[PDB]
Ligand binder design. Structure first.
Ligand SMILES: [Ca+2]
Ligand SMILES: [Ca+2]
Ligand SMILES: [Ca+2]
Ligand SMILES: [Ca+2]
Lengths: 331, 296, 331, 296, 296
């Protein structure tokens, strides 16, 4: 109900202690399309964490984390499943919505941005974030919306790890924030879309395969399949291996290390082990399998999982698959 | 055939920064929508025990704040028609569900579940494929918050049909752990006031957590050389007098308490301290009124 | 074009050397529904292999191999992907189609059957296969069709491994054959359906987890997740472990054995290793990861993969996931 | 701008009981629809070499039997718009594709691919994301069959536009393997008549397989102490005279052959036997006519 | 002729009890509306450098809060068509202007300036009567507030025409002070990232303040016996590695930093400490991206 505000003459503006909006589940609509099907739907992305210094994407350094492609589950938790089934996609309507979850007492800037080039570097300064053509800025306690005008180019879901992603993605969503304080988030981000899918195909596959010749270099790798991680997410240095799954959800991992010896498997950052972890160590080679739940929020100093005190690490081959916790290993 | 309508309190939502489903309780059926499930139907179970089958006609979950306007975050309310499906682990998954609602902790919220026409069985405690005996499961979540003071309370309002009068299932819960075998695991029979993880039995302490609001009558019989003190430093308060009998090798305590239902990870609903060589815990918990509390 | 047959008077019947029908891709149709979506589509199942003695389902002994449930990829190679996304389903139209791929010279019977109870045992005798209410019999060189009349009960995709499957499946398809000869198949089986999906949900998961306490018994197990295998498909006896993936496709496997020692990993039956197999053996525990392609046709004596000369096998924990060959391990 | 229409032969389909895609060739782009791809465009490449970009206006794949009516099984024809997608492994996957057709080996069949309006680059040999430079890939499969005699032949018929005249890309293929380093791997430049696996270099034998139909001019220079005989026991026949120069440390053979294009796993297109201490193979293959065959 | 439209960030407004114009900066043209003026056009200057003349078609200044609702005071936004007029000194004078707007620090605000039809010259750095080369000046003010946390941010949105392509003016600023002559005054050439008062050169310290938001590449060459430490304790953070060369009599530091643009009177954007006998400071500042930061 509307109330009268004490001490205001007509046409005044007021600041309340907090602003909100109810969000309700809405089942996806299926619509007529040039291709196989058009889906009109709405998905939660992430919560904007507060930071004093300017940070983008809650601190995730991966370029194109929220690349607009149906096969990117960092942006589409559900559409990923749908992407599996088709070759090509076209976004028809695209908008990003910000709902504050903090009081009007909270300081800071929340910027919701879209960059047409999904491979462009993340901005770091206040001039940069303000200079995007497709931008929307607000106080963290205010509602906001960014409408991205779509084109009519069909693109491939990148299920073959295209190197020049920009040509298969419809740009990238990103958000930035500064001059905030406290432990709790500013507000929530949603994507609302209308998307067409073109060509039915065999399921693309939910597995990610990572392979690094550490003996060649502690950096670089081959990554095939779903892009749950990027190269920089796997740290192999100084007798430690750290793997950062900075996309939320549940994942099955099998990691096989070519190394003389290894120490403990620790879960000391954004993830928790689910059920039992299966570890087999030998002279020259080790293997670990387990399934974890990740909050997906990036951590500077503590990986999703780490392997400690590792000696003469020559090679990392690993397999990561989004899955159900039901499938965890037993004690 | 027998038509019941009611509204009843379920649980208070504790604030949390990270996502927390069902106040951190990990169990998959916690709030299965079946009138036997006293964790969801704090009031209805007392009637459910007398009948064989149920069908919900109207069903909605309500959230009413008990916190201030300066509390941050969100409270999600959620219904899955598959009562065996795993709990969601990240906030985005919650939005994948067809039937959910989400709001500020300081705002009233409602989630209406569209009911079907199928009858299902009142007892689900034997049943293995529980989805076939439950009308889905309710879940709640919260994130982006802070504080010890609960955000608000959840309630269920429904119109339900019951079908066949039967011998009473009873309102008592019986717990039994052979702690000499293991400090975890147990046989629990009757109504689900507690689950295994709710009875902590370690380091010379016994704590039991009744994390379902109400007034209860308990009797714990302890197989142990000696025990120390019965304490109530958690979500429950002693009602009337506590009756304690201690001997070498065995102890019995019986009392009625009043639980707030809200889980506390530091202090149990009641605890018994300085417990020496605990071999066995056997216990009886029964929802009741405070009128039957023991006298001084 | 129609031809005149030499030596026939009007109204004669003739046997040609072979009969065929072109099959063409048809993209799925999406239609109005009480629930979220109705899919009208058509999928290839299997080819009926010839056998002298009566065999059902090309020799697969698993009851309900072709159970009618969208989450069963033995029956729906594509609908499985779609099932991931929803809670409940209802078949509206269901038919099974047989196209011969052999000449009119070939002997035998091909029976296409549907049993309303998906947990019923497989038939073994000619009286049995003939006694199903929903049956269709032909010579192997003739076309055939079986139309199953659908009901309007909604069922759950069994993504929580229901024990009484019959209550979550719409019966089971099965096919039988006898008095055939030769190496090549008789003909092909297709399923044509109209199916409604009810409730959007988080992806169910593509992973299967198998766990057997061999120290307790060489038989029995816990299986969670997708049902790519059943208990009897994992053989643990006489110093051998054999795993039978008798559903076609590509699978990621991680198998962890509690056993003093193990011998060779062999691929000697219906599957081929893709890329490299990663093996780590220690005293008391071994781990293998690899991805294979399976033809899915069951083999009596040679498993999909086997582990030989295994000593004091105490426990098998394994993880199997349908995937892309792209994700295979590198050399 | 320059508008070409043509029909041309691709490959003969060998029978197989198990599923066999692209006659057992494992490579993902084998029949990428790009006019440079001589494995698909046996005729068009000769024109493609002179232009920068292409656009298909009409495109269809045809299958014409060469086998008898008593041949069992099926021949599948198939188009994926993603030329980098893996080959299907089981028959059911083939049916998941939007654009496929399937028939008896004794029956004519056709698959019409609906073309788009986008121009793409003629050279894909540098390109990494080949889907962006190919108009998908063609695939064929067969199963449930038997015999050594091919089921039938595949053809492509199209109307294609070429855009910019350029310096010729050439019709020659250059192969180079440092066998002293490894018996596999190689540098291959120019047109894709062969791929690494097509040159077998082991056990004192050299076999090369030109599994694309046509007439070719070859020159192989061998770094080796001595070599034995040049033989043609596979899918190819010598045309005219073979010119052979042998010395201690090096050999050169040059000849034009006529390949049937159909792969043979026992006998290569040409082989050279009793080869001692092979260090290096360098070779040149060029599509041509038989008029330029060497004389006796 | 060349038509540009854009929106870009100008400055964050620091709270103040007494009236404070332009965050305390005293200079009369600070925000002259001329595309060369990088203090106002943080983004446009990069284009302005390539053209001779400009004309604004649409022009508006926006204020978006970054502070809380409990912040007191007002933020004034203001446009004077005379870019040489003195800054106002008291709040009442601000209201004398035809084009101003004023609001709470917690409220969005806008000021629309009606543009004219006259073309003016891009370079104003030579010009003496700057009003004839600027389309007025923008000013902001705040009063009746408190706190260190900025109230909100100002932005300019415009549609502007550029006229003649020219040799680039460049994006580099060159600063030069003969400190042996005086600790104040300097020659500054190129873009106005800094003004004399922004380089403090006294008591054995050197501090430079880049009070315009962005990422910059700097090179300072110091004529001095010895220097101590380079520090970043103000509005800027080092990006990548700092390259430092020290000798007896001269030092050079080069690095790229990231400035918040907001002035700090205690700590400069970067400082160099324990500096002995500073005779001369020569420096180069260039707006850039962080991709060109120096490596470790
Ligand atoms: Ca694809
Ligand atoms: Ca495809
Ligand atoms: Ca389910
Ligand atoms: Ca569900």
């Amino acid at each position: 109900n509307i109330s009268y505000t004490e001490g205001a003459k007509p046409g005044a503006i007021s600041a309340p202690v907090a602003i909100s909006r109810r969000v309700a589940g809405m089942k996806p609509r299926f619509v007529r399309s040039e291709g196989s099907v058009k889906i009109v739907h709405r998905e939660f992305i992430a919560s904007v964490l507060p930071s004093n210094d300017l940070t983008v994407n809650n601190g995730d350094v991966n370029i194109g984390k929220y690349r607009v492609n149906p096969s990117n589950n960092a942006l589409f938790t559900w559409l990923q499943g749908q992407a599996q089934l088709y070759d090509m996609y076209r976004f028809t309507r695209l908008r990003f919505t910000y709902i504050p979850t903090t009081g009007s007492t909270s300081t800071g800037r929340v910027s919701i941005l879209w960059d047409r080039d999904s491979q462009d570097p993340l901005p770091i300064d206040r001039a940069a974030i303000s200079s995007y053509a497709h931008y929307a800025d607000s106080a963290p306690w205010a509602e906001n919306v960014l409408v991205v005008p779509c084109d009519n180019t069909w693109r491939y879901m990148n299920d073959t790890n295209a190197v020049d992603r920009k040509l298969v993605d419809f740009g990238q969503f990103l958000f930035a924030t500064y001059s905030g304080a406290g432990a709790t988030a500013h507000g929530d981000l949603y994507v609302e879309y209308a998307v067409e899918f073109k060509d039915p195909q065999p399921i693309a596959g939910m597995v990610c395969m990572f392979d690094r010749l550490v003996s060649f270099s502690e950096v670089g790798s081959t990554i095939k399949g779903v892009n749950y991680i990027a190269d920089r997410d796997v740290i192999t240095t100084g007798g430690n291996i750290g793997v950062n799954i900075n996309i939320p959800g549940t994942y099955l991992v099998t990691i096989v290390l070519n190394a003389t010896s290894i120490g403990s498997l620790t879960f000391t950052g954004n993830s928790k082990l689910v059920g039992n972890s299966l570890n087999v160590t030998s002279s020259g080679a080790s293997a670990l399998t387990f399934t974890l739940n990740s909050t997906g929020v990036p951590n500077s100093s503590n990986s999703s999982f780490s392997v400690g005190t590792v000696v003469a690490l020559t090679r990392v081959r690993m397999t990561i698959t989004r899955c159900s916790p039901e499938t965890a290993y037993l004690a």
